[PDB]
């Protein structure tokens, strides 16, 4: 019955993927951002300039007040609100209803996005990073406890405004080609993984593999960019600059501020390298790689000028909190969050990114010695 969940995600480019949900009795419909990088289910519950609708607890006969406050600070945005429970359903999801913890957002700062069309957030990661603490059961944990939905979900994020699928409770084989390759979930808090090797246009960055995971590496559908630790970011930018040196860019482009443009259809994709991330595999001394095309890390942005050219933002950012495999990495892959077996699977998506001579890929097996040494402690 997974066909009912195909294409159940929508979004505007750079503004997050959201799924339709209902909360309360009678059901109140809200669009909910899909976020594997946090663990709180929270919804707008008060008027806001950027909200077209919000959760009205007074109108729901099944609402229960938990008489506890809550706040969540993300990288830049944050909200605070009031904890409660209510009945929750996903119209284009499994035919179930769960009583879930809900943070009713009453104030926020740089959290809601003008025009994003979503009014709440579904944190899909584990309780360990839930606020105020890990006793607040996350939505997916509630779903799995109260129903027969299997303990896994899969995300097919399709690029560009944008669409995709969140398959709740399983894997839909019509959404990917080739084989699924699995990497262990290192620890159940974020969806933490271990990167064991990085290549750019086939050239190994040749860093201590601990640098790739300093201080963690995670899969985060709620963050747009590939975000890399300082040392890795500098090595990668230097290599990407060298490969594209025939053209000149503002250096604020490499910081993610200035967008670069070319005459519509003349974008020189061939001068930007492919990036291969090798992930720890399921068996001893075995890894696999995913290969990222420049069409993933050069994100298209609407040109502010009257010219209708092709303009792009550099979607690789420097991080001080580890590697983030964000939505632009996930796009074009089918990503299986197999919580029951503590693993994350990658396969080439049915909605894959199209280069002329190159293709995004998930390939294995590879042999990599001492993979355990790549995790940071
Ligand atoms: C370059 O960095 C800026 C940046 C860009 C983006 C998202 C975040 C940060 C963002 O903050 N993302 C968090 C995720 O939950 C973030 N997940 C992380 C995180 C970071 C800090 C604290 C927490 C805890 C709440 C678990 C989690 C692990 C990385 C979820 C989120 C919150 C608010 C608005 C969002 C997304 O909009 C989605 C569209 C924009 C996506 N790009």
3D structure, described in words:
- The protein contains five helices and 26 strands.
- Strands 2-3-8-4-7-6 form a six-stranded mixed β-barrel.
- It is mainly beta.
- It has two domains: 133 residues, Acid Proteases (Cathepsin D, subunit A, domain 1), CATH 2.40.70; 228 residues, Beta Barrel (Cathepsin D, subunit A, domain 1).
- It is globular and about 65 Å long.
- Helices cover 9% and strands 40% of the residues.
- Bound molecules: ligand 0BI.
- The ligand COCc1cc2cc(c1)C(=O)N[C@H]([C@H](O)CNC1(c3cccc(C(C)C)c3)CC1)Cc1cccc(c1)OCCCCN2 binds next to strand 3.
Question: Which features does this protein show?
Answer:
Hydroloase, hydrolase, 5 helices, five-stranded mixed β-sheet, Cathepsin D, subunit A, domain 1, 2 domains, mainly beta, monomer, globular, 377 residues, binds the ligand COCc1cc2cc(c1)C(=O)N[C@H]([C@H](O)CNC1(c3cccc(C(C)C)c3)CC1)Cc1cccc(c1)OCCCCN2
């Amino acid at each position: 019955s997974f066909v009912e969940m195909v294409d159940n995600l929508r979004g505007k480019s750079g503004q997050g993927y959201y799924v339709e949900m209902t909360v309360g009795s009678p059901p109140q419909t809200l669009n909910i951002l899909v976020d594997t990088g946090s663990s709180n289910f929270a919804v707008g519950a008060a008027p806001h300039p950027f909200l077209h609708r919000y959760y009205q607890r007074q109108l729901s006969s099944t609402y229960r007040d938990l008489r506890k406050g809550v706040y969540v600070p993300y990288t830049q945005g944050k909200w605070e609100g009031e904890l409660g429970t209510d009945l929750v359903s996903i119209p284009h999801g499994p035919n179930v209803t769960v009583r879930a913890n809900i943070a009713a957002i009453t104030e926020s700062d740089k959290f809601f996005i003008n025009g994003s069309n979503w009014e709440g957030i579904l944190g899909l990661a584990y309780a360990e990073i839930a606020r105020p603490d890990d006793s607040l059961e996350p939505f997916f944990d509630s779903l799995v406890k109260q129903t027969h939905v299997p303990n896994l979900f899969s995300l097919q994020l399709c690029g560009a405004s944008v669409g995709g699928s969140m398959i709740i409770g399983g894997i839909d084989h019509s959404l990917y080609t080739g084989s699924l390759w699995y990497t262990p979930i290192r620890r159940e808090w974020y969806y933490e993984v271990i990167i064991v090797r990085v290549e750019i246009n086939g050239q190994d960055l040749k860093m201590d593999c601990k640098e790739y995971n300093y201080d963690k590496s995670i899969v985060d559908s709620g963050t747009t960019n590939l975000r890399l630790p300082k040392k890795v970011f500098e090595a990668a930018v230097k290599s990407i600059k060298a490969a594209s040196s025939t053209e000149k860019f503002p250096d604020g482009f490499w910081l993610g501020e200035q967008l670069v443009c070319w005459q519509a259809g003349t974008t020189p994709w061939n001068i930007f390298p492919v990036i291969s991330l090798y992930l720890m595999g399921e068996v001893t001394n075995q890894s696999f790689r995913i290969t990222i095309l420049p069409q993933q890390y050069l994100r298209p942005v609407e040109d502010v000028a009257t010219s209708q050219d092709d303009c792009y933002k550099f979607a690789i950012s420097q991080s001080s909190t580890g590697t983030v495999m964000g939505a632009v990495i996930m796009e074009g892959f089918y990503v299986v969050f197999d919580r029951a077996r503590k693993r994350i699977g990658f396969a080439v998506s049915a909605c894959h990114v199209h280069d002329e001579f190159r293709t995004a890929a998930v390939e294995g097996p590879f042999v990599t010695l001492d993979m355990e040494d790549c995790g940071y402690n």
